[PDB]
């Protein structure tokens, strides 16, 4: 049997490690190791998002997971949605720990514009926020913009191809979060020597109704990848609507980096 | 059609409303309404268990859900495991709001002994906590015993008949909690005029490795119920391992109290 890999999986804003409940055992039955990180103020993390003011604090559990890998171990690092920004941050710290970055229906930042660039572009373009609730919290370093998904918006825009049980689960577990847009507008650009040096691939769902297939091409034209994989019939929450096809794409990716 | 009901579902210690994610849509498809309560320090509730120092604080979100119900509305109140204690507590406060109490693989207290009686009986004969972590938290109410389940103990004793996905989910979501046995040993006995006046039924799983059949028969012999229902092949997490059969049992109950 060919070499197996260690996958580090990074969830989206307002969610938590729980999203990976279908995919983790698929990967582990094929002999791979999986670590599903829970970011700060996410899932069952005991902090409210208001206490996590910066994207570096938010991302700290991912940095700590990578820090604790033994010497010379490398992972396949998979970021979902805002998890794209998280994994780029990590890649700028620990580039030699990362065999390949998997941007899964994810923000794909560049090394030319401020780190918020691709998030700011989507916020300008997106029209279907529905019953999502937006709010602010003032910090000692400025306004921090917060969001809490509404259930109608979830159903129409994230979960529309998911089993109803999955939607019910999400309604039980989703939390107010942040896309850290102010904090990311003030951060130093992602570096070419760190983030830019790491191999990267993009995995996109064909029915993602939050991260559209033309906004992806925009991001990819803006900052190229090695390879683009497409998951036929996936919604945004592809690890819940099409976990087997997602396993298939991750499997393929593992084969290209053995 | 027959009139439908409003089910209020109460989870077990260390868990949260998320346990109900398969059952909830089954009951809603059948036309019923469903509230899955999240108890203090449970699931995504923002407080750690160290902040919830009494069973009455732990139960307060159930109390508030019952208090909020419109005038003359009555619910089918389902308590799972330690949920049995919480629904007995609620029945002693709002007995006229409850059509029937459903003890589901649950502790069934009486009105003769201290509230912790049936737990004390189990805890005395129980062995093999496995990798479960026990700790003590000192409070203005005395010592509070905390537990955090270990994953080997979960797999063997709680989830042995569940899909691997459900076991992975639970590993992602379970939290340190408490059975509040100190506080329950000190509390006033449940009253015959409140709790004792409410209709009650028991639903047991045949393969429950936490609450064994013989102990259930002893609780029911000591505090009678109107009817007993059994779910063939269910583990303790019967809402995960046999949701359809649990639905079938709750349907049968709802037909009985139309
Ligand atoms: Cl996101
Ligand atoms: Cl329990």
């Amino acid at each position: 049997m060919e070499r197996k890999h260690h996958f580090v999986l990074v969830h989206n804003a307002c969610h938590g490690a729980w999203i990976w409940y279908k995919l983790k055992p698929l990967l582990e039955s094929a002999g791979h190791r999986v670590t599903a990180v829970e970011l700060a103020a996410s899932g069952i993390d005991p902090r409210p998002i208001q206490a996590v003011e910066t994207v570096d604090e938010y991302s700290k559990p991912l940095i700590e997971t990578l820090k604790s890998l033994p010497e010379n171990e490398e992972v396949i690092l998979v970021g979902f949605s805002f998890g794209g920004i998280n994994i780029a941050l990590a890649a700028d710290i620990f580039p030699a720990k990362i065999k390949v970055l998997v941007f899964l229906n994810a923000f794909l930042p560049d090394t030319t514009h401020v780190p918020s660039h691709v998030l700011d572009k989507l916020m300008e373009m997106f029209g279907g926020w529905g019953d999502t609730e937006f709010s602010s919290h003032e910090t000692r370093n400025g306004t921090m913009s917060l969001l809490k998904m509404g259930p109608k918006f979830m159903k129409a825009r994230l979960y529309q191809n998911c089993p109803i049980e999955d939607y019910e689960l999400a309604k039980m577990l989703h939390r107010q979060g942040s896309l850290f847009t102010e904090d990311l507008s003030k951060k130093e650009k992602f570096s070419e020597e760190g983030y830019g040096s790491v191999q990267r691939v993009y995995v996109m769902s064909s029915e993602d109704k939050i991260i559209p297939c033309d906004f992806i091409r925009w991001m990819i034209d803006n900052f190229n990848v090695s390879k683009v994989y497409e998951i036929d019939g996936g919604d945004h929450m592809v690890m819940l609507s099409k976990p087997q096809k997602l396993f298939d794409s991750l499997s393929a990716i593992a084969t290209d980096y053995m």
Side-chain angles (χ1 to χ4, degrees), chain A:
Chain A
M1 41 146 278
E2 33 132 39
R3 265 280 183 191
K4 301 307 190 172
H5 284 91
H6 181 180
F7 288 83
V8 178
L9 309 179
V10 191
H11 65 77
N12 50 336
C14 296
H15 296 70
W18 60 262
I19 68 169
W20 305 113
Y21 84 100
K22 305 187 199 176
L23 177 70
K24 179 165 175 309
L26 293 176
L27 288 167
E28 292 175 356
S29 289
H32 303 294
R33 276 210 294 128
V34 179
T35 305
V37 178
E38 183 121 271
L39 302 174
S42 301
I44 59 169
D45 192 274
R47 313 153 265 184
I49 189 71
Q50 283 74 6
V52 179
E53 288 184 358
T54 71
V55 79
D56 284 1
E57 187 72 356
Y58 174 68
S59 299
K60 199 183 143 170
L62 177 52
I63 301 324
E64 294 294 323
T65 294
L66 300 177
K67 197 185 307 191
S68 77
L69 298 163
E71 227 210 340
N72 307 305
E73 185 173 339
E74 293 171 329
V75 299
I76 298 175
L77 184 54
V78 180
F80 172 50
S81 203
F82 188 75
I85 295 307
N86 298 111
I87 69 178
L89 289 165
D92 234 5
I93 295 166
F94 293 117
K97 299 186 178 218
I98 292 161
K99 193 147 51 277
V100 63
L101 295 171
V102 183
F103 288 85
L104 178 60
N105 298 339
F107 294 106
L108 169 72
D110 71 29
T111 54
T112 295
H113 308 80
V114 295
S116 59
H117 186 62
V118 304
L119 261 43
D120 301 326
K121 184 81 182 43
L122 197 65
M123 296 294 113
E124 296 167 14
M125 132 176 339
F126 188 48
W129 283 115
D131 49 358
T132 296
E133 317 168 79
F134 290 102
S135 49
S136 267
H137 160 80
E138 291 291 328
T139 70
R140 73 204 201 87
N141 291 321
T143 305
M144 179 191 180
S145 280
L146 307 178
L147 82 173
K148 188 181 175 183
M149 300 183 300
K152 297 172 50 181
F153 166 79
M154 294 166 63
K155 184 66 177 181
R157 305 286 169 160
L158 272 67
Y159 290 86
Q160 82 280 0
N161 295 341
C162 290
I164 188 170
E165 288 81 11
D166 293 288
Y167 175 67
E168 298 287 335
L169 176 68
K171 284 195 302 180
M172 295 152 153
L173 294 171
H174 78 104
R175 293 172 61 182
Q176 186 177 57
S178 181
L179 306 183
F180 295 93
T181 51
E182 296 97 348
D183 190 50
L184 282 151
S185 61
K186 295 175 341 195
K187 167 173 298 284
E188 290 268 73
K189 304 164 169 9
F190 291 109
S191 82
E192 271 287 291
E193 320 86 71
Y195 167 55
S197 69
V198 186
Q199 288 283 119
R200 55 180 181 278
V201 297
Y202 202 98
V203 177
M204 59 184 296
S205 277
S206 69
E207 301 184 11
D208 188 320
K209 288 172 93 208
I210 237 289
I211 296 203
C213 310
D214 88 321
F215 174 77
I216 293 155
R217 249 18 142 298
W218 178 73
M219 290 192 287
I220 282 148
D221 248 290
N222 192 250
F223 194 69
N224 231 134
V225 298
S226 277
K227 201 160 198 323
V228 171
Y229 301 76
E230 192 163 57
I231 292 171
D232 182 13
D235 59 18
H236 184 61
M237 297 305 291
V238 67
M239 63 297 297
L240 305 177
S241 40
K242 305 283 178 187
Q244 188 70 57
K245 295 184 164 168
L246 179 56
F247 166 83
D248 297 340
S249 305
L250 300 170
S251 297
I253 285 159
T255 299
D256 308 357
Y257 303 75
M258 290 170 292

